[PDB]
Structures are given as structure tokens and as C-alpha cells.
Design a protein around this nucleic acid. Structure first.
Lengths: 276, 53, 276, 256, 50, 51, 44
DNA sequence: AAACTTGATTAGGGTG
DNA sequence: CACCGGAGCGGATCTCGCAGTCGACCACCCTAATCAAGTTT
DNA sequence: GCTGCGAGATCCGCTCCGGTG
DNA sequence: GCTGCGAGATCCGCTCCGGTG
């Protein structure tokens, strides 16, 4: 009873309907009735791309930026990815040279390790790029006309401008009020456990330390093995790799196959005895 | 509250009192025209009643 | 911290922060810490109105409309609220007279009982309003700077224009293609249980038949006391009024106090014996 | 299934398929199948007329059974315009089938094609049924009468046209306060419940069947067609009786 | 149906049982709380089961 | 409450307010005609309290 | 509130009522009022 | 021959 | 001593703006300044 | 050779403490 | 006296059937 289908198919090619009404009225199985509009051009072409996307907090000392026009005031904004502590400064022009100086300042305030930033020419500029390179830093490109990779800086442009609207009458200076907003959200905004971003950056700089971090080499390594079940039946043990770290009931491991970190439940582990 | 002129929202105005509450919008009086109005919650900046008092 | 508070208060008056960070760093109870910005001027000012809003399922034959400018083509669109079956027609001008004729047509297609529509002059026009009145119909006003009360018609302007972009090459007429889209989504779009809106409108017209409603009058009424417990102790029967309908373990009732329909669990009901 | 019991009654009394549906709450295409399958007596089915009033060509649509209608003003009786009109008309409804005369717009190749594009039964021919033709006549007479009432009262001809459409389809009522709207609607209900429930599913199937005597299963009988497969049941004519029967699927052997 | 949801109207809920027709609202059980309630008829979308 | 026609007791009506307690009768409004009325206590059935 | 709330803290040292009574006097937070009565050694 | 009312045709305020 | 109630906070739900300065020119409905056309004491 | 999360109001799921037939 | 909802594409869970020592 699936030979109604080419006619029903025609009736989509004519009258272009849902898999359901077509499914029912032609009384078929519905699923290939969906494969219709999968295979339609007309009812297909024009569908939208449902796509969630993602942002990268990324690693510590990874950063994100945009200029903002506040009340006709160029303000270039220095905004972390991972724990999202920030900075910003009012600027007279967006220019690559000016920009380069601004980032010299802010870079000097920290050890910022990398960046996401958009297609704005000053971000993009040759010696700007060479300056990131000069300093051994990773720029990454906010793609054109996607602020959403530039998420947090635009978010914070929101937050900030709200705070501006509070504070600026309290001051001689717009830029002391800029300092005030800067102060507050890098500090005075505190949440969860009642901690600023500043807490977290700085803390992590203490945790980003190389020596304690390098000292741990003395701790033992073991290697360990794994295998895969096809129709229930586990493969050979696919080699020995360091137990990168053990957990309870499972571990940290890498597949060189993916070159990517991985888990094995401790039953599918071989513990590999010491030298001796 | 505020209002839209070619869509362009007003400044925040009054403020004044919730007369009749509804979900997402209400009744309020225009002090200037002494006249009741219905305002989109988006354009309704809420306040606790006592104000400075 | 109870007397930390005026200083923390100052620190809001200075530095204008969230109830939380203030709550935690000054280590107080938070709730009056919210009553801060309740009582702040500054931070009270510039916050945004978090407000969800709602649209009306509203009434059988209750309706919603907006005109369209598809490819420079005025198309006035006839769109139900409750079950959201629709209609539309291409128009040469938006005008109140023209409009009035259009609605005469569409009104004649149905017994549409009411309307939401915006501030467009033709919707708003005097004799338009008098025409709704002339026919005993409820216009309601889509309000300034809320297409969102006009939700569905704009939604459907989306849906439709997608379907236009499919169908219009298949036809001599744009307006036969308009018929095609009209056809499809009022019919051929079918979902859930595989039913159009047309199903639901028409069904409900059968459902809304007055004779059946009038007939059920013969069925018995009882009244019932409901009552309310303060520190465990139920009030007088409040009052006594008809068990509008009984459920299992509870009922349908009205509080004349609210003049609004209500529930009482059958324990807090008094069943009121018959005449006899 | 009440369908074979309704068939039991019609085999006796020879009513209208209308009253078979109504009496037994069966489908109407079931019932129409009975009267067409009842040798003694041997929906969403329409007829059209263009019509001229006040030098205004108007297209009309007339359901053959409920008697409910539609009409719309026309620039010209052309096939193409009319093809648009039947787009819109099919838009307002879920029509199955049609009558008309041989009028050129109707008979036209892309038009008849378009009926096929819609999967419709179009019938052009000298429309011959005094059942239909009387009603179409009453329609147009009542109609342009009601125009002659309403048209002064309105800014638009087509608004008052709307007016008459209301009058007859809605405000005009009879019996228990049923307009042909209410009729049509109610018909669409159970008909589009049965049509979905039945015709989409399976077609042209045979089976062997038996009858339980005090619950004692009969011999296997037929081969006969599976006429309407039910939910846990089917519909079948026992060839000897010339009578329809409910058979439970357990007493069915479907012939693949 | 739909009720308070996150704020005001939530996302739609049920399909439930159409129990008693009133004017402007009616009472249906919450399958979640096993509890009879009200939904404004503007918070309703009516359906035949099958 | 009910009312008599040629003595034939009408159907019971209400339940309603005892608008005033009398001797042998009381006061009641007809909700239908919006009119105060008296009903002899035999044509009354008093309704017990919430208990 | 936060203008009432200090003033009631002033006044309880004078008049030493229930935290309830000041909640219900000044329209303050009760639990803060309770915090005063606890932090008021006098009712303690 | 001043004033007194009403119809006609372009300039501003709320809505798609 | 069991049951209900006021006060409290972690978690959960809903809507929305950051995207440079924003308007320019349409179409419809409603209101209004200004000019032209009559009489009347 | 790159990814929408964040600020702003509301509300249900819980506990701690007090009142009392 | 007025209120945001639905279409598109993914992602995870549940059910029926089949393979593995």
C-alpha cells in the first residue's frame, strides 16, 4: 500500500503540505512522508537554521573587547572571557594606533594571554596583529557582523551604561564615573558566594602559577588499557596510556586516536604495575 | 512610564500610581492630561508605592 | 550587621550596588538589602521592567488583524485569537471604507464575535467602530507600540510570506497563491492530532451551539456552603450558592465577593439537600 | 460499529443515506455507499453557477446536500479568474466533489486539471437532477431577492453580497434553529472523523471469516472483501444473505 | 492551558480534560499536582481528544 | 419555597434568603420577578446551618 | 522602611516592646525587629 | 458694510 | 504533642539589550489652520 | 579557522519558628 | 480596559527487535 506514494508525492509537488496530512489522507507510514519535504525543494530551501551556538569563557587570561559609543563617547572595553572581570577606558578615536596604545596599557595591567575581537579595523590592523604576535598573544576574530562572539562586551555595554546613568551626576568627570562603574562591577558586583570577578581572576593567577603546577611532576605515573564492544563483545585491549589522573570508579586518559582527554571506568582499566 | 512616537519611546515620566493592575499592563492616569492610560509593561518602570514618603 | 546597615546604605548611596553583594559583604539579611534600592532613588531609576505579559486565547470567533505590505502589496489579514484559524485578502489601500468592506466580506463568512486590532486609522475609524457596534461586535484596541497584542497576525505574516515565496511562481495570480497559502495553513497545516485550525473553529461552532447549552438547564442544581480555615478553624458557610458543577473531590463555584468562578474541595463543601 | 446494523435497517426499509447516518450515527459515505450499494434505491458535493445581477457576474457555490452555499462577485467568467475563485473557495472549505454545467471555465483543461490537482470529483454535464436543480433555482431566486433587500443599505455591493450570504447561510434557519452552516459543520465533524479513521488506512483487502454460535467459532467463509475495517472489528457482506456483518478481527483471517 | 508559568503566562500545558464550561474560564486538574484549578479561557486552547 | 395555584402547590423555588421570619410564614423575594413575597411555612423548607 | 527601621531601633531601647509590635508599628521587617530584641540586651 | 456660520483643501498627531 | 502559619533563602522561570549616529519616504485615520461662499440686524 | 550569555523582575520548592483545638 | 506565540532543526530518553560471551 506504498504505491499511493508517488501520487501523494505529486500532491506535495502540487499542493505542498505537511508530512502528516499527507501521511493520513494517503494513509501511509509518515516517516518517509517527512522524507518528502526533506527531499522537497519547495517546502525544504526556505527553512531556517535552528542553531544554538556557544560562547567561550575559555582559559584564564583570555579576553574580549569592543568599543562602545556612549553619549557620543568612544569607550574601549576590556573584558575577560573565562571569569569575565573587565576594564574599559574612554577614548577619543578608535584608531589602531590609539588602540595599540590602549592595549599596551591594559596588557601591562595584567598577563592577558589571548583575545576575541571583531572586524573593527583597529583590532584588525597590521601592526596591531604584529603586536599581539610581538608579545606572543592570541588574537581571535569576532567574525563580521556577529556581535554574539563579542557577547560579553556587548552585554556589559548594557550593564555599564545603566551604571553610568546612575553615577555620572555624582562626579566632576564622566571618566571618574567610568572609574566608578569599573570599580563596582569588577569589584562591588559580588554574587554566588559573594565574590567579584576580581576575586576570581586574581585567585586564578595564584592558581595559574607554574611552580606548584610544575612541582607536581614528582608524583607517580602509571599507565593503563581499553577495548570496545561490537554487538556486546569487547575488542582487544587497545594499548597502554598514562593514567593522567585517577578518579573513583574512573580516570583521566587520552585517546591518541582523538588526541583528546577521556574517561575510562575503572573496570575497563588495566592498572599497569610499577617498575621495580 | 513612557510613550511611543513613530514607535520612539518617551522618556520616563511622572512617576505616578498603579490604578488597575493587569498582567503586562495596567491603568494609570496621565497627570498632564488628567486622563487614564494603558501602558506596555516594557514602558512601565515599576516603583514601590511610598516614594520618598 | 544590623548597624552596619547605615554604612552599607551609604555605600549604596555612594557606590550603588545589588542587594546581594551589599548583603553579603556587609553580611546582613538580604531582604531589606533589597528594600535599599526599593528606597534608592538612583538605582530605583534606571532599572528595566522585567515583565512577561500575555496574549489572549480569548474567544471563540474572537479575532485579530493587521494589514500587510508584502512586496509592496497591502494584504489585510483575518486571524483568529483562540484557535487561530485565519483568512486574509490583498487590498489596494488600507482605508477605513475599503477596510469596512473587507470586513463585511469576512464577517459574512463567519460569526466572528469580537476583535483585537491596532491603532491603524481604518481599524480606528468612526463608522468602522460604529459598524462593529452596528453589528454588536467587540473591537479591542491593539495599543501603541505593542505589535505584541497583535502577535499572531504578525506571526502569521511571517509564516505566510514564507509560503508565498514557495507558491507564487506556481500561479498566474499572486492572489491565487494567496489563496494557496490561505488554504494550506487554514487547512493543510495540521498538527498535534493532525488537525487544521479549520477543524477546530468549525468543531467549536458545533460546540458553541446555543440550543444545547439552553437545554442543559433541566439538569439539577444544588447549592453549597464553602468556608475558610483560619488557624485551622473553618468559617461559616460563605454563604451558600449553587454547585455550578461538581468534580471529583471538588467543584465549580463562584465567590460573589470576587464575582469569579472558583473551586472548593468537597470536604469544605456543604451539600445542600433538595426541595421535596 | 453501527455500520452493519444501519445496513440491516436499510435493507429492510429503504430510507435516505441521510437518515441512515442520522439514525445510526454511522458515516455518511458509509450511508451513501449503502444506498449506492442498495439495489432497491438504485457529501461535500457541490454545484456552481455564475450569475449576472446589475451587470455583475457573480460566481456561486452550492452544496448539493446541506444546501449551504457560497457566492462571490466576478469580473468575468474566464477559466483563470475562476481558477482563482475555486482556490479561495476550496480555501474556505474541504470540498470533496462537484456538479456543474459544461460552462467553459468549468470544463477547461487546466480547470479540470486543477480539480485533479485537488483530487476532486468534478462533474460537468447538463445538470439533470431535479433534487439539485430545484434547490439551485430556489437559491438564485431567494438570493437576488435578498440582494434587492440589502444592497441599498451598504456602501459596497460586495458587502451587501456578504449580507445575503449571511442571511441565507446563517441567519436563515429552520427546524431546530439550524442554518445550512450548522448542517454543513456538523456533517464535517463525523464525516472527517470517519474519513480519517477509515479511508486513509487500508483499501482493497479480502479475508476469510466465520461466525460464532454461542461463542463456538464457525467455519471459515468467503473469500470476501474487507469493506470497512473497524477498531477490533471489520465490516463484511455475507454473500448468501446480501447483508452486512460485523466480524471481530480474531474471527478474521485477512487474505494478504 | 497555561498559568503563572515563569511570570504571568507560562508555556502551554496539558493537554488536559475539559471538565466544565463556564464563562471566561473553567476548572481542569493539574496532572502534576493532581489538583483542580482554573485557566482563563484566554489561557485555553480547546481540543477533541482523538 | 413554593407557591400555590388554586391551592395546587407550585414547584419549590430558591433556595433564598429568609428575608424576615414571620409567624406561619416569612419573607422572600422572587428572583424571577424581583419582588418581595411571603410563603407559608408549609410551603417553606428551612435550610439547616453549616454544621 | 530603612528610615523607619533605625528609628524603631532607637525607640525600642526606650520602649522595649515586641519585635512584633515594631514590625506592626513602623512596618519594618519583623526578622530585623527580632534581631533588635535579641540584640537588645534589655529584653534579654 | 461688520459679524456669523459652514463647506472645501492641504498641514500636523497615532497605527501598520 | 500534632497541625497550620509567618518569615527566610536557594533555586527556578520569563523578558530583553549590547551590537556607531539613527531616521527617509509610504499609506490610513483623525484633527485643525485658513480661504471662499451665503445671510442678518 | 570560529560558538549568546547576562541584567531584571517574579514565583515555586523547601526549612525554622511561633501559636493553639 | 489589555496580556507573545509558533516554525525549524537538534539532543536525549523510551520501546521493540536482534546479537554477544
Amino acid at each position: 500500500w506504498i504505491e499511493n506514494i508517488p501520487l501523494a508525492e505529486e500532491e506535495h509537488n502540487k499542493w505542498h503540505q505537511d508530512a502528516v496530512s499527507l501521511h493520513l489522507e494517503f494513509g501511509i507510514p509518515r516517516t518517509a512522508a517527512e522524507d518528502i519535504v526533506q527531499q522537497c525543494d519547495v517546502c525544504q530551501e526556505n527553512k531556517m537554521p535552528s542553531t544554538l551556538r556557544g560562547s567561550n569563557k575559555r582559559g584564564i587570561d583570555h579576553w574580549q573587547v569592543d568599543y562602545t559609543h556612549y553619549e557620543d563617547k568612544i569607550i574601549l572595553v576590556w573584558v575577560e572571557t573565562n571569569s569575565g572581570l573587565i576594564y574599559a577606558e574612554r577614548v577619543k578615536g578608535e584608531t589602531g594606533q590609539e588602540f595599540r596604545v590602549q592595549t599596551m596599557k591594559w596588557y601591562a595591567m595584567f598577563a592577558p594571554k589571548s583575545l576575541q575581537s571583531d572586524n573593527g579595523p583597529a583590532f584588525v590592523a597590521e601592526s596591531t596583529q604584529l603586536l599581539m604576535k610581538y608579545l606572543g598573544i592570541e588574537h581571535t576574530t569576532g567574525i563580521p557582523w556577529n556581535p554574539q562572539s563579542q557577547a560579553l562586551v556587548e552585554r556589559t555595554h548594557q550593564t555599564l551604561k545603566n551604571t553610568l546613568e546612575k553615577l555620572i551626576p555624582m562626579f566632576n568627570a564622566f571618566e571618574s564615573a567610568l572609574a566608578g562603574t569599573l570599580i563596582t562591577l569588577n569589584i562591588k558586583r559580588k554574587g554566588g558566594l559573594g565574590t567579584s570577578p576580581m576575586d576570581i581572576f586574581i585567585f586564578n593567577k595564584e592558581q595559574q602559577r607554574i611552580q606548584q603546577q610544575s612541582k607536581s611532576k614528582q608524583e607517580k605515573i602509571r599507565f593503563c588499557y581499553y577495548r570496545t564492544r561490537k554487538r556486546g563483545h569487547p575488542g582487544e585491549w587497545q594499548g597502554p596510556t598514562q593514567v593522567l589522573w585517577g578518579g573513583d570508579g574512573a580516570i583521566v586518559v587520552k585517546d591518541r586516536g582523538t588526541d583528546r582527554y577521556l574517561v575510562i571506568a575503572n573496570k575497563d582499566v588495566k592498572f599497569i604495575p610499577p617498575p621495580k | 512610564y513612557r510613550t511611543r512616537k513613530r514607535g520612539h519611546p518617551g522618556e520616563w515620566q511622572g512617576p505616578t500610581q498603579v490604578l488597575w493592575g493587569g498582567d503586562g499592563a495596567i491603568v494609570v492616569k496621565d497627570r498632564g492630561t488628567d486622563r487614564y492610560l494603558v501602558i506596555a509593561n516594557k514602558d512601565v518602570k515599576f516603583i514601590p508605592p511610598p516614594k520618598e514618603i
